[PDB]
Structures are given as structure tokens and as C-alpha cells.
């Protein structure tokens, strides 16, 4: 039978691609009309999915990008036991096997990542992995440092062989109106059915604490060009990591913005919020492509 | 009126004549059309606002009317050199000079430029007058105290001895802190309009007292900010700059960390210096559109 999205759509139907280990990943396009002057590749936070980037894409669309994007593997349409992943790696190798295939295309062009959250620790470990391969990095309240998980619960490292016992385990849910201030969005946030809601897996929480412990690691060697969103009330992700982030990092080129009593999700925050960050990664990253 | 230690009057110069009755000098950098806003620049210690030369012409260049006095104490103001009564002298003469400015030029926005000492003026200026500025770039701003400083016995014993020799020198700092563009650092230390004599307890007690206000001033800071920092600044401690981003209530606060460059980043190498001058022009000009 023909390979299908966990949604029973076949492949076939659907831009996509498949990655090393012979799983599908959906892809997205977002191309312009004329020649794009730059790529720009969009990496989407744990649990969501890219469909969830229509708007940001659209505004970069008309900066005469090329915007691309693929719901990481066990995410959105994509193949994969849900929010699951052998090695947190398997989602920098797969951008970087999407990145390559653009550029294949499209040589000569620069490119650019956008990451958010968990979406924001695989583009700086991609950037990190390829230095001065990438012209620039958008990165909204990254996850970047580990949520004062303190030495006993990360000895849950112990029930991640718990996890081979009970491998569903799970950390529990999150209160889904942490994410922003605005309803509206958290609303629809809690009604797309290709969000996963669950609560993280602990073996899931391992590889993230995997991530973490690399972005630390990396920021010695970071040097690509990055402008960096952050919200202060942001109970995901700590805004002290954004500061961390501007600290360790080598980049010559660096710019924090912090909003002001914001939640996580500053792209769809209160619409003063949402407005001040299309237009600063509009600027940003439009000086960036005269460059 | 009076002469200069340069033997010339006061009244010669453009100047300004404050509530203890000394006489300031003034500089004005006017564009020939009629202007999009104010800006004042207040400088550091030990300086004078003949130092801020090109950055004014880039901004007169903007259509902007920029403004400045030399704070007493310092360049061709009067006063005893780099000595005080009380710090907010400083915050009041910029004051006085806003006041009249804005008398001129009603309804146009005014903003501030300060740096080092110039940017804990500049903060105190506009806590002292909450909504009134359009906005606040801040270079190397000094908001913190050196590590051993500010210690209650330290304290009581800078008091002790202002009470004997209140202009006992704390001994020079060594210029090569300032930047790394020698060049730079070799202008500094010919200029004669600039005291690179050692601070005096006197004065040091009041940088203490500064530093305390703008701690408090913080939180009810809500003025629009850029803040730029070079991470190897021995005079101001990148860690202030952190702390300045997250205490500050404006909505509107923007912060660029400039990697392994000193003190000061508008005449430090080129490839910051240009960077510094590009990016006030950027944040500035977003916010003149505004008017």
C-alpha cells in the first residue's frame, strides 16, 4: 500500500522527502514569484508542526525568499512514533539533508535558518555543525537552557530504562495558557489536530536535555549572525537562557529583543507583540539579504 | 562670565548658564531643513561632547538637531574638574537644556544619546520624566559598581576619607581599557579637554550614589532603548548590560552585544565602530518615521 501520513493522506499527494532513515517528513514551500534573493529553511518547536508558520512564511515570502520547512520527524504529517526520536542528531541531519537538496537548486543563493523553541536548539546545532555555511539565524525563545530540572528528577535518566519498562511514560502535560497572552491563539493552539498535546515522554525529555547539553557545547564555535526573541515571562524557556545565549555565543553579529511580560509564543502573542516581531525579523533579515 | 584656563571668556562660546550659576559650553549640530526631532548627547566622565563629532554629523544627517553641553566639571564647562556636589546636578542641567530646547522646537520628539557615565545621566534623565522621551540609546552605560566597591565598609571608608582628602586621586586607569583601535586610545590620551587624571574619592562617592539611583530607577523605566555593549569592557561589566535589559520595564528594548570589543564601541575598530554608527542610524530612524 502507498506510504501515508499518520493523518492517511498518501505521500504521494504531498511535497515531501525521506530522510536517512527511510521515514517520509512532509515538506512546505513557500516560493516567490521572481528570483528568491535567499532560502530561508523554518524549523518548528516540539509537539507542533509547520503549518503553524503560514503567516511568518508569508512576510518572507515577500521579501523575496525562498522559505521551506518539513514537520520534523514523529511531528505534524510526518512519519514517526509521536514526539519520539531516536537521537536528538536526527533532526539536524534531516534539515541539513533538506537544506542541501534546496541548495542543490538553487545554488550560489544564501540561506538562512528560523527556529523557535525546541525548532531554535536544531537551528543552532545545525549552524554549529556547518560553520560559515549559513548567512543567518532567527531564533524565537530557543530552547536553550534546561528548566531547573534538578539532579533527582534527571536521574530519570533512570526511567528512561523505566521507559524500555514503561516506555510511554510521561512528564505530564502542559497548561496549554503559558504558551501566550493572547486567547484567541491559545485557543487555536488547543483545537489543530496536527499539534500533539501529550505530555513529554521521558525518553523525549532525555534527548532534549541531549540538545541542551550540545547548544551549551556549541556556543564556543557559534559564529553565524543571529538575532534572538525572547519573551521575560516565558515559562518554557527561561529568558535568563537568552541572555546566557548572548553571553557565550562568538557571533560577531547579535541581537536580543526582549518583549516585555510576553509568554513563549511571541509570533502569536498579543497583537502588539506578534507586530513588533514580523517587523524586526522583516528588517533583520532584509538588511541581511542586501547585504 | 569669566575666562577659560585657555584665557578665553565664556560668554564667547555658545554655553548655557545653570541653577548654580556656571556656565556650561554647548554644541549644536543643525541640519539645514527643519528637523525630524531632538537628540541631546550627554558624555562620559573625564570626556567632553567635542567627542561625539562624527556620530552628531551621522545623525544631523538624519535630520535630526542634535544637541549637547559639556557636564560641569568637564571639558569647556566650568567647575573644578571632575567634581561634583551632587550627581544629579548633571541629570538637572540636562534637563534645563531639554526644557529649552523643547521650548523651541514644541511638539517635536526628543531623544537621548549617552554613554558610560553619559548613559547612567541619560537613564536618571528619563526616569525623572516618565513618557516624555521618544527613546534612549545608551553606549556602555554605567550601571553597576566594580566588585569590591560598593561594600558597606568601603563605603564608610571613602567617606571617612573624603572628610580629609576629598580630592585624593583613586590613581588612573590604564587607556588601553578603552579600545582596542590604538589609534583611538592615542587621541584620548592628547587631547587636553580631557581629565585622564585619576577619579577623586569626592567624585567616586558620587558615581556610587549614581549607580544606586539607576538601580532603583530601573523599574520604573519605561522609555524605548538600544543598548550596545562590547563583552570585553573592563570600565562597565557586559553582565550590567544584562541586568539593564531585564530590569527595565520598557516594551521597547533592544540589546547588541559587540564580541570581544572594550569600552568604547563608537571608536573602537572599524568594523565595530561602523557597525555602532549603522545600527543607532536603523534604530533611530524607525523611530522619526514614527513622529
Known sequence: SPRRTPQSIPYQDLPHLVNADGQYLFCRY?????????????????????????????????????????????????????????????????????????????????????????????????AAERPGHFAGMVLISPLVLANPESAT???????????????????????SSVLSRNKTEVDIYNSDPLICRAGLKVCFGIQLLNAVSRVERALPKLTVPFLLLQGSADRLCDSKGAYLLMELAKSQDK?????????????????????????????????????
Open 30 to 126: 513557500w516560493k516567490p514569484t521572481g528570483t528568491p534573493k535567499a532560502l530561508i529553511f523554518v524549523s518548528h518547536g516540539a509537539g507542533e508542526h509547520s503549518g503553524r508558520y503560514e503567516e511568518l512564511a508569508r512576510m518572507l515570502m515577500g521579501l523575496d525568499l525562498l522559505v521551506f520547512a518539513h514537520d520534523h520527524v514523529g511531528h505534524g504529517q510526518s512519519e514517526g512514533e509521536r514526539m519520539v526520536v531516536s537521537d536528538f542528531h536526527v533532526f539536524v541531519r534531516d534539515v541539513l539533508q533538506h537544506v542541501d537538496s534546496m541548495q542543490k537548486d538553487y545554488p550560489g543563493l544564501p540561506v538562512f535558518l528560523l527556529g523557535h523553541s525546541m525548532g531554535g536548539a536544531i537551528a543552532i546545532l545545525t
Open 153 to 175: 528528577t534527571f536521574k530519570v535518566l533512570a526511567a528512561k530504562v523505566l521507559n524500555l519498562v514503561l516506555p510511554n511514560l510521561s512528564l505530564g502535560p502542559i497548561d
Open 255 to 291: 541581537t536580543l529583543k526582549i518583549y516585555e511580560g510576553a509568554y513563549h509564543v511571541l509570533h502569536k502573542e498579543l497583537p502588539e507583540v506578534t507586530n513588533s516581531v514580523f517587523h524586526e525579523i522583516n528588517m533583520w533579515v532584509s538588511q541581511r539579504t542586501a547585504t
